[PDB]
Amino acid sequence: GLVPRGSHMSQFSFTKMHGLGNSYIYVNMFEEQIPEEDLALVAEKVSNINTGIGADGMILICPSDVAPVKMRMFNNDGSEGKSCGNGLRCVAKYAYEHKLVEDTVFTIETLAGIVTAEVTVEEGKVTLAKIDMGAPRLTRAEIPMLGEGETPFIRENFLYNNHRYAFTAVSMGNPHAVIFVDDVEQAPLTTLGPVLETHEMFPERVNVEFIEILNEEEMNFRVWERCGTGACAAVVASILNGKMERGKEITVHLAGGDLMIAWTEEGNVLMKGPAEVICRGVYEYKIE
Amino acid sequence: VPRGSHMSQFSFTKMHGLGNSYIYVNMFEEQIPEEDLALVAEKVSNINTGIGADGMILICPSDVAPVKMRMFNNDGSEGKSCGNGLRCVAKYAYEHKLVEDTVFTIETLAGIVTAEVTVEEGKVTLAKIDMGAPRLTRAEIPMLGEGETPFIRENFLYNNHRYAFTAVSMGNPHAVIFVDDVEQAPLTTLGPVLETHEMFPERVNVEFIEILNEEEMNFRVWERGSGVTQACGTGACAAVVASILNGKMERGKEITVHLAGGDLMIAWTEEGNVLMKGPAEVICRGVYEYKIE
């Protein structure tokens, strides 16, 4: 091994993009160059708000042996991990707009495995990208949730402040409890959300969604996080309760904006969401 | 009543001095309507939906200097910098040929500021800013109690230790405490109790300093309103004034202050004004895109 001496100064072009929740620094590794041994450190430097740009991390768009593009995600502490969802709509947008892909439907290689992306192009620009969020899981042990009762699905009452609420439990890889409200503005979000989050019956806590169904293809959405798996859980819950239909694109109005979700008759929940450019430029750095 | 929407963009440069960072916009080359500035500052400073910064700094034409600095915080309020961004403005102005000389002035909301850039290889490495004279009266801090002759020094009992602070204003209030090791200064503990003590009605920034020799010190600060910061320029000046008052350092000597974020070179000149020299660094440059509905 070696104790390095000297210093090196480089730069690369980047794009900051925002999809749902996170925002990352996107680097095209087809055109840019960062030494492998520098990646973790560069990810940390560039994600810092004070001495970097400021992001939840850095995502490299790279050559792949198995897909047109490959995604590598580094967190803001420099650790490389599974994206599990985050950044995919932005990678899909970037891939298509910079012609690393030739169709609207294409694949992306991620740590977890190869993923399908389908972009919506409106005026030569990608507005939305559609991704597979998997099947919901509706069993107590899968939520996870204590107690018995899962047939046809999990629905339980809950007394809070002299009023009988009813929530529907769904896992989309993470636990969700979905309550239907008449008016989403007077949802007990600050008050019922937190006390239900940490209730005994949820060993691993739970995300709490209050939703108002507008019609058979539209709903307003607020979540008390333990959020696209929340919007999916909320849609799956409305279909389970007979408020909405299977295999139809339902549009969810969040505080952020709109997600378009369909629980396919095939089984998967497919989620369509926006990706936007914040800025593009050249980042300069020095490693000593 | 406004309606419709505009999608726009501008070129910017993110720069920092000791890890306090801003988005810099050259308003000789860029256009942003006045009624959008607060909203743009807020939008662009947001780490999630924006770029990420402590705010936005416009470099503008001036009637009275080569350049004017306007500073907006990340909540969109326009305010006085108390020294923030002046070195990056000086670097930017010189490198983008908005000035002809290494010595020039910058118009600010707090008054016109002299700047002197150190150029090394066509680039500005350090900028030296006039921070003005210290103010040493209780009324100038501002502060309660009586006695400022020759200056303000109070004892303070906290947690069975006796401390002593010297009170100084560089446009903002400072209480300077001397310690033997800044790594074990009661920064997070004595910092906030003195910050909010009733004798400081507008609060105070609490500096802890280790004198290493007569031209050199280590520095930490509990900032009023914030807490523990990497880099407080006015505070570093306050600290150097405080040590000269207390006979620990000399007037007119250039003193290196080792802050957490880097070094600052400060002299309390015999004329009265305090001169502060430090780094300024580009992080990135680019185009920011935005929409206002």
From Swiss-Prot, chain B:
Entries under Pfam families matching the protein: DAP_epimerase (PF01678)
Marked site: Could be important to modulate the pK values of the two catalytic cysteine residues: H174, E223
Known EC number: 5.1.1.7
Localization in the cell: Cytoplasm
Keywords tagged on the record: Amino-acid biosynthesis, Cytoplasm, Isomerase, Lysine biosynthesis
Pathway: Amino-acid biosynthesis; L-lysine biosynthesis via DAP pathway; DL-2,6-diaminopimelate from LL-2,6-diaminopimelate: step 1/1
Superkingdom: Bacteria
InterPro entries named among the record's database cross-references: DAP_epimerase_AS, DAP_epimerase_DapF
Cellular component, GO annotation: cytosol
Catalyses which reaction(s): (2S,6S)-2,6-diaminopimelate = meso-2,6-diaminopimelate
Binding site for substrate: N20, N73, G83, N84, N172, N205, E223, R224, G233, T234
Main enzyme class: isomerase
Keyword Cytoplasm attributed: yes
A single GO BP: lysine biosynthetic process via diaminopimelate
Job description of the protein: Catalyzes the stereoinversion of LL-2,6-diaminopimelate (L,L-DAP) to meso-diaminopimelate (meso-DAP), a precursor of L-lysine and an essential component of the bacterial peptidoglycan.
Subunit structure: Homodimer.
The name this protein goes by in its record: Diaminopimelate epimerase
Originating species: Bacillus anthracis
Record gene name: dapF
